[PDB]
Symmetry: D2
Subunit: 208 residues, 4 copies
């Protein structure tokens, strides 16, 4: 039973201080057996791209069975409100944050999104999920609850969903050049040879 990967959205940034916040994460779709899995469902601003991709795939949001989060930042999780039948997976320490302290307005939005998750599995890191096709790593070098996911796929080989420990190619290159996070560098060394790096705010890359 093979796991197939599709990148529904490659993420990016839209940010003007005090005026515009439309960051949007990469959205990863996986099919394995009877599971239809999303990692980082993304932000509202990706709605038209997702509409198009769901239509190509012949599926509805109602068919998504499992949704995993690298972390609890709105630009990665907002679209979670679409998936009423999914089980949601997230690192347990997210429960130690007071999201209502994020600002009157912003906190209310986090709270409404988070409250919509009716079935939640809390992770610790090191789990291997979906018949060992998905390995979970606790990678708290961005947010305390941050996770990265290593995927054993048929069509794309061994794929690392980095999350925001490496938001884009430049951040990855900074690690290679030796002046980035020592923790992230050590983590990448631990993971070892992979076929594809899937960043949250850039197009993916085959490591050199």
């Amino acid at each position: 039973h093979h796991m197939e990967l599709k990148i529904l959205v490659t993420g990016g940034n839209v940010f003007v201080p005090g005026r515009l916040n439309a960051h949007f994460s990469t959205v990863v779709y996986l099919e394995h057996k009877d599971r239809r899995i999303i990692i980082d469902p993304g932000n509202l601003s990706s709605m038209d791209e997702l509409e198009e991709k769901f239509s190509e795939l012949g599926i509805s949001p109602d068919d998504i069975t499992d949704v995993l989060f690298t972390h609890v930042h709105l630009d990665h999780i907002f679209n979670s409100v679409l998936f009423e039948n999914a089980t949601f997976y997230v690192h347990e320490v997210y429960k130690t944050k007071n999201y209502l302290s994020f600002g009157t307005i912003v906190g209310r939005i986090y709270s409404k999104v988070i409250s919509s998750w009716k079935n939640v599995v809390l992770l610790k890191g090191e789990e291997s999920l979906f018949d060992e096709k998905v390995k979970v790593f606790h990678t708290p070098w961005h947010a305390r609850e941050h996770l990265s996911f290593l995927l054993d796929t048929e069509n794309a080989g061994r794929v690392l969903i980095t999350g925001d420990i490496t938001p884009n190619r430049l951040s990855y290159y900074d690690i290679i050049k030796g002046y980035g996070s020592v923790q992230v560098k050590n983590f990448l060394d631990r993971v070892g040879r992979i076929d594809l790096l899937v960043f949250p705010h850039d197009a993916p890359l085959k490591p050199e």
Copy 2:
């Protein structure tokens, strides 16, 4: 009892076909007597600006008493989900649209936003609200439920919230130059002399003499 206007957000556009939709409306705040009124609460992408402005004003979303919509487009209405204590005002023909036919995904979002409105006043056009400080016009030259609002303010004089019949200054200039919508031009002629045009996707403008 004077009505005071503050423009919390001047709107704009962020659109890349097939990739990015982050249009965001102008957000207008009005204080009159014990009412705290918003016209077009805007889009999620304005959340940091709104945070700042609410903080300057010393208010919370819970203090908003009334929210009016030019029309039912997400970039104007999304933030309506923040105002749990407000009465919502919208043109009655919005009920004749099937929002779930807007796309599986996009329809679901519209439906969830619209369902959050627990107290709704249905407008027809021509209403004079808030002790005659707000005049409602049915201006369906964009969407069937579209409304424009004329405000009698103390601090900004006579202010027309156009909505999307004139999204920005260039669209207004096209009317003035004679090659824009005949219906919108007629409407502006009807309204007559005003002090300020507040567009949904641009900075406001003092009109030509």
Copy 3:
């Protein structure tokens, strides 16, 4: 001799009053005989998409022979600076505008772009260009120099490059619904049956 169309970039809008102006036009590429033609070269913010498309096509900006402008707005014309070997086509009345009056900063950028056009063909409207494959219409319902182009293509049929008289699909729908520009509506009636509408700030549409 057939004319082939490729849409290199579908345009859009990025605009925050007082803070951000990154509007970018649709960029149309046409090959006909030995001509490599661009209509509305676009804005700086399309640079990565253009790099990718030029690389797919196996061409350089040096190989572009002809560049036509719907009108002289920066989000349509900026990338003209890349095409040093091209002949530029533009409506003659652009010369009657004082671009340095656009603002000290913005005027300077217009002036620098416009000064880079070394070979210019001035159009009036109604011209048929490239062995009658491109018909030029003067459509001054946005800017006095504004042009629209009707293209007789092999791969996409009859294609109207609207320019900013209809920036996107919504503006076209407003005309269909009867409350948009009467002049644009009459223009579209005059053009008649076409296979594709190519807007400057949206994906194209089969009418």
Copy 4:
């Protein structure tokens, strides 16, 4: 003779892979004696904001005497084409990069911008400029030519223009939390107590005690 700081633009990001690149840096303006100084003139997309700030200041691009670059990335340097009378300052090792190899189109744009700089001062790091009001640091943890600038200002105290070694507040917080660049962290330790951090793609921040 005091040096006055004005932040003309706070920078940001606009990036959609394969479709849109409109990153734009913070733009810093300094007045000292007869000098009108820009650090990182920014990107084309800031043109309306710059227009408005230049108008407020009562100056033209022709009045800018000095322009310094944190580094040679288009979103920081593009607007350099506006300043015909300026001396440009940049780390010498930029000359070792082949900008034509950045891609046919992108390389062309870099080359045209860089060619417009008629008077250039090549920096090495550790220079003290403008009567010692500006200290230059070689901070190559982003690009080989990358510089940061420490400013002694009258109106904002001691200000660090970080450049892209810390693009925004989150990158700075990562350093404070202990999992960011060791080199950047050691650099901030070396700089010591300052009043303001000016990031290239975010609003500035008063540092942590």
